[PDB]
Design a protein around this ligand. Sequence first.
Ligand SMILES: [Mn+2]
Ligand SMILES: [Mn+2]
Ligand SMILES: [Mn+2]
Ligand SMILES: [Mn+2]
Ligand SMILES: [Mn+2]
Ligand SMILES: [Mn+2]
Ligand SMILES: [Mn+2]
Ligand SMILES: [Mn+2]
Ligand SMILES: [Mn+2]
Ligand SMILES: [Mn+2]
Ligand SMILES: [Mn+2]
Ligand SMILES: [Mn+2]
Ligand SMILES: [Mn+2]
Ligand code: NA
Ligand code: NA
Ligand code: NA
Ligand code: NA
Ligand code: NA
Ligand code: NA
Lengths: 185, 185, 185, 185, 185, 185
Amino acid sequence: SARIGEVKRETKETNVSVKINLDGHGVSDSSTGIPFLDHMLDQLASHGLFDVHVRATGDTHIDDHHTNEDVALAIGTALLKALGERKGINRFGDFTAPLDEALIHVSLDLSGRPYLGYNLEIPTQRVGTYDTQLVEHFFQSLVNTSGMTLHIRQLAGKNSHHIIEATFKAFARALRQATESDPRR
Amino acid sequence: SARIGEVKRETKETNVSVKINLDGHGVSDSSTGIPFLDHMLDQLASHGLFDVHVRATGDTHIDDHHTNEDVALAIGTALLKALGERKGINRFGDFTAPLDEALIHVSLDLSGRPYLGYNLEIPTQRVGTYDTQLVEHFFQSLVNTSGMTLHIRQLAGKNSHHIIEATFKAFARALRQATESDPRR
Amino acid sequence: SARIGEVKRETKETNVSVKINLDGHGVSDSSTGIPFLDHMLDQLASHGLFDVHVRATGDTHIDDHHTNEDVALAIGTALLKALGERKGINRFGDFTAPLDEALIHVSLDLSGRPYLGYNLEIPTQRVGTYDTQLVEHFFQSLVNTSGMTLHIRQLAGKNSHHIIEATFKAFARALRQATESDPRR
Amino acid sequence: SARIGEVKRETKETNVSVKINLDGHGVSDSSTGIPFLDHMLDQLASHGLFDVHVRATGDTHIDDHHTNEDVALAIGTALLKALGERKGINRFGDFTAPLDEALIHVSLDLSGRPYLGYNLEIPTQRVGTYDTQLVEHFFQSLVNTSGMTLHIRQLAGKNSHHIIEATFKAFARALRQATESDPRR
Amino acid sequence: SARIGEVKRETKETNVSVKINLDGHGVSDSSTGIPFLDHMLDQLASHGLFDVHVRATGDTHIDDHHTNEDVALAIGTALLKALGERKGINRFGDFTAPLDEALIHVSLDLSGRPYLGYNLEIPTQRVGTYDTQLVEHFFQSLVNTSGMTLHIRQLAGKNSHHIIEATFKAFARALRQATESDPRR
Amino acid sequence: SARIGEVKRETKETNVSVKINLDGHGVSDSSTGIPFLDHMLDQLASHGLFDVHVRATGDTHIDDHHTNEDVALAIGTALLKALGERKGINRFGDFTAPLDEALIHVSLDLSGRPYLGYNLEIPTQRVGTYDTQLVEHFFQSLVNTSGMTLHIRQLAGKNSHHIIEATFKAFARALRQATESDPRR
Ligand SMILES: [Mn+2]
Ligand SMILES: [Mn+2]
Ligand SMILES: [Mn+2]
Ligand SMILES: [Mn+2]
Ligand SMILES: [Mn+2]
Ligand SMILES: [Mn+2]
Ligand SMILES: [Mn+2]
Ligand SMILES: [Mn+2]
Ligand SMILES: [Mn+2]
Ligand SMILES: [Mn+2]
Ligand SMILES: [Mn+2]
Ligand SMILES: [Mn+2]
Ligand SMILES: [Mn+2]
Ligand code: NA
Ligand code: NA
Ligand code: NA
Ligand code: NA
Ligand code: NA
Ligand code: NA
């Protein structure tokens, strides 16, 4: 039976609905009001073979910060719920993905202890309309509600969109690994 | 009886109305034409337990500078009027507020001698559409019309929205302390 | 009615029982198998006016690490439970406590978002038999389950016991402030 | 019943009489033969809400050193006497006070163990006729007879009169906090 | 017989009309499609007492560059035409203007030989939607068609809007002096 | 006819009377209890062609600080009063004055927004009995009550009396310029 986590979260600032299938086929269906984040969430589905359904509405006239954070928090919680008792899984994931000149190493453990190690150096302040400080906030928030240990290490990269997208490819692949069944467990 | 200060400031550039209640319940009612400043004025009301009413429009087609300044000047005057003869109050306020990784120490004295000490280092140029140079200008202008001695010291912080918002939290709580009754005066 | 949180948690490594009263009288009843940690828990009770009850049976023949961690995790959860809906509280706490030459500033927010900022430099590796690396882990683990934003800043200090104990005094006092009723809320 | 400490002390060099009320109304009555010190003692009364009565005569034809020291020693003893058994008090005090561009953080504990941490950098040698080295000596001597743990930290300042006066404001306010009743003890 | 210069110039990128009266009363009537430039041209009128009429229709969907340049070229030519044979004028101008923290020294000679000396350091990339690289280009183009020797020296300044606007105030006042009659010539 | 501003102000520390005529003939009538300040106020009258009447008494046995500050505050208020609506004036003033080896550039704007930029480096602590820190405090306090934008820049100088006196000559001549009628307004 497919492992599915669903979360509805309403704050003063944002309304968020998430549904994630750990055992999906890469179905991407994300609409957050933040086009660059939607693009990254599509990468998450396609490279992780998760089914990702996200809806958010919020106060983007202020900036994208509150929406970014609330989506990430909800996603972490959805992952936690989908994982259930975590029986018979690999638990650890490790992958290095390129995107042209960018190269990003992600290592993670579905440990129940939140930690983010992050060293990206994104050389521009905006990719499209997306504030590049929000990348770290997205992963930190996801970590805090999922309880995962996550290390994100930039090995190479110059183009901001390549650095971020390569990070999502590596994260998706590492998370696929961690959530898959270990054949000897 | 509640201490309420009301100010109309009209310049070539901006039309401003402010009403502040020092003895409020955190009623937030601010519309400046600058969404991020509206968000910070909400934080002022919420964290300081002030009632804050602001209406402004101006030449935002140029940039946010003139409106940001005229709003700040009028708030400073409003505070001055609300304080009246300052009988029986703490006068001094001192608070350090975190917001995640950010940590800001604000110390103030309702002295009648304007001074701004400010050392924030905001690492991005825009939060949403808000020019981060305007944060210092907001506090300088407020100080100049209120006659407040104000020091703002950045102890930690990386996210620009966090640093600015922690500053308003700390300022609001320090100002609440300073405007409150001293039980021995 | 007093705000009391109780946690019983057993792992492969440790068997822990914690009960904390936020509205206590400083009743101290901590026995962890780690004498220096018991001394610090006593400081928490006495300086915070919490009633603190801790029992732990752990694998200290290996080292104190698993016991220290499991105690801290359970305390964080106990605090979370005791706080309930967090209605009407100060929420923020800020205190700087000396102990002779040592001086430690603690600032915290009962935010629901875990974060530890810690900069202690403890110049010796052992205080009695207690590994001084475990101080940071204690606070990190406590933050992670309580969901608090916590900043610990060393302003002065040379004696390791003084540095660590001053940190617990300042923490206890900042947490007492945060958990107390705000008379205007 | 008001907590009052009285000291008479005669040395080869000076004759000093001190009376301090911890529970006063800011009555300032200091005549030491050192006008700048009188001015600082007035600040201590007004900002601390102590009643301060001081008389000293001595060998100021030599310099102000012996008088300054003997006044400080007597005040320390007077505080210790007034404190009595220290039942039910806050014991710790912490305050940061501005005076224009100056900003001074004082932290203290009524511990019974004397310690002075002092880092003021006063950039002129005389304020009026008062030797600026005597500021440190005043606080050191006070600490030695009171048994106080006292930390004085300069955060900002350029004007010598401002730096010293802000220190006395912050000290008076921290000391008031420490000597006041803790409502839960 | 006011000295009036008029230029109508159309390129494949822009269509521009400028009319300047050296002997004006500050009448400001500038619409370029670049709101910040219009604000600066208003400053030129107000502080210089020129009558300034500008209209431009340009390709601002690309960026403000071609419009900014073509407006500046046309203003330079209009000044040249207005000056005519330059009989009896001061010819040199020199003014230092503050705007809050900003302080800008402008020195010019209506010499017939184009030169721009410019050392502004504008610390942000955008003021509103206005690219701050365009300030130097405005003055360079103006110099090139007018044939003036112009030095712009930043003595102080932190806020980009203040730096640029002070530059325009100082330029306008220096140009007013240079274009005015020398009573002895 | 003549623009005259009068201010009487008494505090616990000082008693001050100021009368200034902006349209004077350099009548000098200053007695502050601080002989070097008297001499500088004489320079203000003679170089500015202001009529300057000042009387002050106060606690100079403590030091000259309170007197210096209260005189400057009163002067600033008196200038503000005398200026009235500020109709038809130059508003800006700019002058560089030598005194032997000293050279001081003063630039100011009668703007309504207080700002002091000050970089004097006065190499001795006392000129006669006058504490050289008081020069800066004089100008800061004057700016604060007058609402002027004032920049004081040391270009050269070694002798402390010369540096200070040149500053007052330049300030006086700049203020004369700013307060004089613009013949085209
Ligand atoms: Mn956030
Ligand atoms: Mn892409
Ligand atoms: Mn401005
Ligand atoms: Mn926010
Ligand atoms: Mn282990
Ligand atoms: Mn561990
Ligand atoms: Mn101990
Ligand atoms: Mn001695
Ligand atoms: Mn004083
Ligand atoms: Mn082009
Ligand atoms: Mn070009
Ligand atoms: Mn402007
Ligand atoms: Mn002062
Ligand atoms: Na398996
Ligand atoms: Na009161
Ligand atoms: Na409450
Ligand atoms: Na008590
Ligand atoms: Na002429
Ligand atoms: Na005029």
